[PDB]
Design a protein around this ligand. Structure first.
Ligand SMILES: [Zn+2]
Lengths: 364, 98
């Protein structure tokens, strides 16, 4: 209440009742994870969208003030109407509203994904409302897309603007030079965002596997939305390709095959320092990360098939890959990296080989 | 000590290299040591300093579009050889240190 006299001071007190109420909302079904990236235990909120989000996602929400205003569940003071909004909404409600019509092939980011993916996911959902109005999905849903992308020249390392065309009709991605310069079957394409490697926030790695040799192509768009549209157009094209190439296969079984992120990437010594990429069973090494082709490859089969990974030497740390034929020795700078690498190799070893993987092994 | 424009086409009459000074001002103004014009570049956009002890530091000006090795940067950051810088929309450079 107040104080006695002319001063008549108002005293607020320690109640923090409104914060307290919002905190309880975190216990409700659907609110256990960040609405946007899935991180456990969200501690921020957008009070205009009625979602519970992680710290990182809240920073992205702050870039979009016309759509989202954010408060810390604990560290911020709340108004009643704001608490009431959260009470009548939440993450489940936001899924039905903003994630109403998300195509099954559309990439959903996780916490370790790059900023571009996480930001564009939040923007597509809330700002553009892409999954409320399916018209907005045309860029990646038409089965055809063309446009200019900045592509790294194969040996010379310059990124120059070249025309790309993705066509589901012909089942290919192609590009033209300054008849196409290259035509790449969707069967053989993978795409992975690699902003740190490429040194660009919008950097996308497209790989093309032909005749057991993988060609690395590095591209970017000036506009973050346009590059993410390309990414998801690629996924749409793979999905449609896989549905017809493998009918009888469920969409659920097909969706994790659309595009693959690398398990592990980094410099190791082999003693020469090389950049390494672990793409499934396939350990490639390069002189430079942005080389078009691997210097060499090491195949990692199963335990069954005569493959083992070992610590130590028979850089400080050591890893040994024992293949049926030869032994492979690698040096890791640190023990964190050594652990992560070994974990990656162990994942290959612990899994039974497929007929196609035997075909790959035969080559190596 | 120089910046390589990663978008310069060698087959065209295009400037590839900008040499850095000890204290290098980058932006669109006549006053800047490296004068870049284009979308998302300010009159005064960035600052590169080469320390007495060979150390290279990038300082973005406020409210600028600035990425180093693909992630945004809003305070002083140390550069190494081969680092990639994006200024504005498409001023895309690579760093050569001796
Ligand atoms: Zn999140």
């Amino acid at each position: 209440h107040h104080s006695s006299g002319r001063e008549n001071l108002y005293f607020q007190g320690m109640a923090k009742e409104r914060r307290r109420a919002v905190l309880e909302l975190l216990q409700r079904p659907g609110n256990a994870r960040c609405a946007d990236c899935g991180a456990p235990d969200p501690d921020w909120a957008s009070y205009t969208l009625g979602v519970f989000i992680c710290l990182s996602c809240s920073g992205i929400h702050r870039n979009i003030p016309q759509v989202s205003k954010v408060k810390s569940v604990r560290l911020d003071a709340w108004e009643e109407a704001q608490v009431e909004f959260m009470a009548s909404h939440g993450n489940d409600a936001a899924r039905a509203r903003f994630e109403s019509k998300v195509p099954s092939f559309y990439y959903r980011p996780t916490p370790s994904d790059c900023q571009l993916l996480r930001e564009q996911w939040i923007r597509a959902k809330y700002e553009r409302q892409e999954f409320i109005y399916p018209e907005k999905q045309e860029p990646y849903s038409a089965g055809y897309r063309e446009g200019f992308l900045w592509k790294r020249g194969r040996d010379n390392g310059q990124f120059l603007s070249r025309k790309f065309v993705l066509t589901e009709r012909e089942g290919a991605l192609k590009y033209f030079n300054r008849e196409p310069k290259a035509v790449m079957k969707i069967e053989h394409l993978n795409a992975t965002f690699q902003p740190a490697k490429i040194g660009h926030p919008h950097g996308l790695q497209v790989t093309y596997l032909k005749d057991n040799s993988t060609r690395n192509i590095f591209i970017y768009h000036e506009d973050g939305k346009e590059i993410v549209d390309w990414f998801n157009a690629l996924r749409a094209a793979r999905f449609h390709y896989l549905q017809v190439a493998f009918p009888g296969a469920s969409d659920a079984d097909l969706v994790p095959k659309l595009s693959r992120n690398y398990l592990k990437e980094g410099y190791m010594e082999k003693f020469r320092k090389r950049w390494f990429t672990m793409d499934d069973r396939r350990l490639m090494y390069f002189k430079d990360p942005l080389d078009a082709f691997a210097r060499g490859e090491v195949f990692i089969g199963s335990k069954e098939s005569g493959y083992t990974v070992l610590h130590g030497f028979p850089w400080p740390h050591g890893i040994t890959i024992v293949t049926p034929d030869r032994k492979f020795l690698f040096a890791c700078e640190t023990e964190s990296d050594q652990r992560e690498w070994v974990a990656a190799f162990q994942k290959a070893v612990d899994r039974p080989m497929l007929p196609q993987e035997y075909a790959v092994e035969a080559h190596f | 000590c120089f910046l390589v424009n990663l978008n310069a086409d060698p087959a065209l009459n295009e400037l590839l290299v900008y040499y850095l000074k000890e204290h290098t001002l980058i932006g669109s103004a006549n006053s800047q040591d490296i004068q870049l014009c284009g979308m998302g570049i300010l009159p005064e956009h960035c600052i590169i300093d080469i320390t007495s002890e060979g150390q290279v530091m990038l300082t973005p000006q406020k409210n600028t579009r600035t990425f180093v090795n693909g992630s945004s940067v809003s305070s002083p950051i140390q550069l190494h050889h081969g680092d990639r810088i994006l200024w504005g929309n498409n001023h895309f450079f690579r760093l050569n240190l001796p």
